[PDB]
Write a protein that binds this DNA or RNA. Structure first.
Ligand SMILES: Nc1nc2c(ncn2[C@@H]2O[C@H](COP(=O)(O)OP(=O)(O)NP(=O)(O)O)[C@@H](O)[C@H]2O)c(=O)[nH]1
Ligand SMILES: [Mg+2]
Ligand SMILES: [Mg+2]
Ligand SMILES: [Mg+2]
Ligand SMILES: [Mg+2]
Ligand SMILES: [Mg+2]
Ligand SMILES: [Mg+2]
Ligand SMILES: [Mg+2]
Ligand SMILES: [Mg+2]
Ligand SMILES: [Mg+2]
Ligand SMILES: [Mg+2]
Ligand SMILES: [Mg+2]
Ligand SMILES: [Mg+2]
Ligand SMILES: [Mg+2]
Ligand SMILES: [Mg+2]
Ligand SMILES: [Mg+2]
Ligand SMILES: [Mg+2]
Ligand SMILES: [Mg+2]
Ligand SMILES: [Mg+2]
Ligand SMILES: [Mg+2]
Ligand SMILES: [Mg+2]
Ligand SMILES: [Mg+2]
Ligand SMILES: [Mg+2]
Ligand SMILES: [Mg+2]
Ligand SMILES: [Mg+2]
Ligand SMILES: [Mg+2]
Ligand SMILES: [Mg+2]
Ligand SMILES: [Mg+2]
Ligand SMILES: [Mg+2]
Ligand SMILES: [Mg+2]
Ligand SMILES: [Zn+2]
Lengths: 313, 14, 129
RNA sequence: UACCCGCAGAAGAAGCACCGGCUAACUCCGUGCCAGCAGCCGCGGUAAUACGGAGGGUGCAAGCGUUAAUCGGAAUUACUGGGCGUAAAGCGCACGCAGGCGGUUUGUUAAGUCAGAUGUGAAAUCCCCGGGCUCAACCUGGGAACUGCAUCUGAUACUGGCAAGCUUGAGUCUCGUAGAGGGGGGUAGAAUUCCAGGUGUAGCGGUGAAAUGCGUAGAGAUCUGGAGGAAUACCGGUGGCGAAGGCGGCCCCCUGGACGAAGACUGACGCUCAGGUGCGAAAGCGUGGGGAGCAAACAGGAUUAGAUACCCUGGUAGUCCAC
RNA sequence: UUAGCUAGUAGGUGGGGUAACGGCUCACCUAGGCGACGAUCCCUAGCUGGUCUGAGAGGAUGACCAGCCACACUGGAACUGAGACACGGUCCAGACUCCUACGGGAGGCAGCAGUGGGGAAUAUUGCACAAUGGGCGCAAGCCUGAUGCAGCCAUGCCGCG
């Protein structure tokens, strides 16, 4: 009770019982939430009132009353958790990966399917590239040229080398960015080399395994660019929620496969066991790499095994 | 239960 | 083991009374005769006989109503783990005076009704309810 | 001063809490899981007797509610008057001191207990019958009570002590029977793996499917021979033995308990157990041996979103023995 | 989640000591004493007749009344006297405050009220020796913040309008 001025501000982080709300000038001011709020995410503009200070100048919390409309939203379902939004109100996502512990290609493919359902442009960014040789660097560059023909910008950086940070910052100003990736892929290290942020906490960095990666940093913490825009950190995520829509939308989740539709034999096609698939003929031609095609029906065979019990929102 | 047990130690009042 | 033979005596009486047994036997002693003779004179049992001199064996004849237990329940009161003694005016009654309480005093074994004219107290043996 | 006479006129003299149930009393409006309420149960997002207000009522009363504290309810530390197969609880088991308890017959002691009496348990408080202050509170007469303790005289059934016993408790002997009871020392034959030789050829191996691995230096398979290690098929079964954990090829040696038959014999020698004492699955630890197979960690290959686990090919510690 | 404690300690002789017995004290002699029926150590607490609760057994507690013990700023010591190791007696030390001419002295409200302070919270800086009890004295008489009273505090009980 005894609330303050209704105004518009940006929520810094989410802590369940309360949230960190930045004001219209840059004041870190933690607030709790209203009981009728169905969801609140990182970086969501809200209506809020900063309570009332009991001591003169010393206030404890305020409240967050209302939530504005969403521009975008990042909803990923989960077994026995349901559809949960992670972040919202964003224009650009930056897929951040590293060569250690692994560099998979199936982790890349289903963020592409999600961003086609959100009208967001993902950017492939590799880290930890200073540990490889030029024979190994040329092969990973060859594996990313397939991701360059399909229209996505590929910038290959390193935190301990500061290579290619300046072209990474030029296309990133004026927008908010999720640094999506797996556990221990160099998310927190790239936050240190771009921002110049306050070095007194500067992150939680424990990723030490035998051949694996650890997710030490939590869900999302908000900061600001020196030029403009916001950053959104991501958890170490190994999950794939494809409970959203039909497999017709899986065909729309890939860029170069748009221009090859309507060219096969039948009006409906599984594209794996059907004779005369023109998409399969494009892979056999070599204009589409077979790594993407074998992973494509791996997505379709994944929906033969995730669908099994049932789930609905 | 035994009376001879309570000779050594009575019932412990909380 | 057999450390309270009066409690062993009351165990054999209560079982055969409920299990429709016509007659029971038990090892005899001087004190078991001094209790069963009182129960014979108070209408609870019928007769008792002695058998054997180097192995004294006491016998009791049971008693029924229409096949119903005459002695419904009996309660050993004093015991070798805890002795119970009362005075001539603190003698407890059984079922407010219906049942009898066997109390052994210096004038022999008698009831609390018989201890009023005797005016003595001592050890309570059993509540013959 | 109490007390009493006289005067005037209802004149000077009633509030608080509750009202969903517990727990006495019901409707209306406002508010909209917000505000609030609340000892418990839990009430209130569009009809709330539970919030706020009004009407009316109920319970008390010159007081009424609230908070804090003690006991009762609470048999919820159970002497009266609780439980321990699964709700919390029977030590993993055994020996055994102190301690508690103890068959049967007689005599004795009168310790415990019981009977009677004396002394004492200050008064006040409480209880019984009274008296007094107009009444009550309060004050007070006497009695009872203070279930206590000490001493003396008694009774001897029970408990205790002493004395003499008795044999059914508990033990002892003989003749026997059954058993994977323990310890020690030999020994057997399959099977596994390794090694040697022979014949013999393209796969063996493994899985849901494959791969790692092995093999033309001839694997695998078969046969002969040898070495080492650990375990004992069938018998073998709610079968047996042991205090328990447990214990299984055969044979010898040492040794423990259990049970039955016929008598003889000691005469309660007994039961129980806080500390104390020993045994006590497997893992693990120290020292020195030993090494097949199996197998933490780990190696490698599939699986997968990742595989750390599952699956497979290997493999150290450990599993073996002594201390 | 305290198991060993104790050398004047346990006992004896002799001397000393107090009103009385006694390691109460001293020299000597003995090595015992205490203790799983709780010695010793630590923490807490005045106790009892009682009050309250409870059908009773029990349980919690010790204000007012009465009995006893301890204490009188802290610590120690002795005198006086029949009786004190002495609440309004003394001496010494420490602490605090006051007076002072700077060298010194004075003082003990846990007596009646009353102030400051603490805390949720507890009173008038009253009257009287009329009665009762006590002190002194042959008595008269004097003294008594004991006590008898009064005021404040709906603080409790009871009664009335
Ligand atoms: N050699 C090298 N190490 C790098 C580079 N970038 C990051 N690292 C190291 O990689 C580790 C992982 O970095 P970190 O940012 O913590 O990973 P993360 O993805 O944020 N982890 P999390 O999932 O917990 O948030 C760190 O030890 C960091 O120093 C790089 O370019 N080169
Ligand atoms: Mg991080
Ligand atoms: Mg009602
Ligand atoms: Mg109200
Ligand atoms: Mg309404
Ligand atoms: Mg009144
Ligand atoms: Mg309470
Ligand atoms: Mg109780
Ligand atoms: Mg119970
Ligand atoms: Mg249980
Ligand atoms: Mg057991
Ligand atoms: Mg005689
Ligand atoms: Mg009295
Ligand atoms: Mg009297
Ligand atoms: Mg009286
Ligand atoms: Mg009257
Ligand atoms: Mg006897
Ligand atoms: Mg073999
Ligand atoms: Mg004989
Ligand atoms: Mg070791
Ligand atoms: Mg393994
Ligand atoms: Mg070892
Ligand atoms: Mg002397
Ligand atoms: Mg007084
Ligand atoms: Mg007193
Ligand atoms: Mg004194
Ligand atoms: Mg003094
Ligand atoms: Mg004084
Ligand atoms: Mg005073
Ligand atoms: Mg104060
Ligand atoms: Zn097709």
């Amino acid at each position: 009770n005894l609330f303050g001025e209704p105004d518009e501000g940006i929520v810094i982080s989410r802590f369940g019982m309360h949230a960190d709300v930045e004001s219209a000038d840059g004041d870190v001011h933690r607030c709790n939430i209203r009981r009728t709020i169905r969801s609140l995410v990182t970086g969501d503009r809200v209506v809020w009132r900063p309570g009332k200070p009991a001591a003169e100048g010393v206030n404890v919390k305020g409240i967050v009353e209302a939530v504005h409309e969403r521009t975008s939203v990042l909803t990923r379902p989960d077994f026995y958790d349901g559809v949960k939004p992670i972040a919202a109100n964003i224009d650009q996502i930056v897929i951040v990966s590293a060569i250690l512990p692994e560099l998979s290609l199936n982790i890349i493919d289903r963020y592409l399917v999600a961003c086609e359902t959100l009208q967001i442009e993902p950017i492939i960014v590799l880290n930890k590239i200073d540990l490889l040789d030029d024979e190994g660097m040329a092969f990973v560059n060859e594996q990313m040229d397939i991701y360059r023909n399909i229209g996505y910008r590929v910038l290959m950086v390193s935190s301990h080398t500061q290579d290619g940070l300046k072209p990474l910052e030029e296309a990133l100003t004026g927008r908010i960015s999720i640094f999506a990736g797996q556990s221990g892929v160099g998310k927190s290290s790239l936050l240190n080399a771009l921002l110049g942020l306050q070095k007194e906490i500067l992150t939680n960095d424990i990723s030490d395994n035998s051949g694996l990666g650890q997710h030490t940093t939590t869900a999302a913490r908000l900061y600001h660019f020196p030029h403009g825009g916001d950053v959104i950190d991501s958890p170490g995520v190994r999950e794939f929620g494809l409970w959203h829509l039909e497999p017709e939308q899986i065909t729309q989740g890939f860029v170069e496969f748009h221009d090859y539709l309507g060219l096969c034999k039948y009006r409906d096609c599984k594209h794996d066991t059907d004779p005369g698939c023109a998409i399969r003929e494009a892979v056999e031609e070599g204009k589409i790499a077979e790594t993407r095609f074998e992973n494509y029906h791996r997505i379709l065979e994944s929906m033969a095994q995730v669908k099994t019990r049932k789930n609905f929102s | 239960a035994t009376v001879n047990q309570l000779v050594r130690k009575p019932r412990a009042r909380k | 083991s057999m450390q309270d033979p009066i409690a062993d005596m009351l165990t054999r009486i209560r079982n055969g009374q409920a299990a429709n047994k016509a007659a029971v036997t038990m090892p005899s002693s001087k004190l078991k005769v001094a209790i069963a003779n009182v129960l014979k004179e108070e209408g609870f049992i019928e007769d008792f006989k002695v058998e054997g001199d180097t192995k004294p064996e006491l016998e009791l004849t049971l008693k029924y109503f229409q096949g119903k237990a005459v002695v419904e329940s009996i309660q050993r009161v004093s015991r070798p783990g805890l002795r119970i003694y009362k005075r001539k005016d603190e003698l407890p009654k059984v079922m407010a005076g219906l049942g009898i309480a066997v109390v052994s005093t210096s004038k022999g074994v008698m009831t609390d009704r018989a201890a009023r004219q005797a005016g003595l107290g001592g050890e309570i043996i059993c509540y013959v309810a």
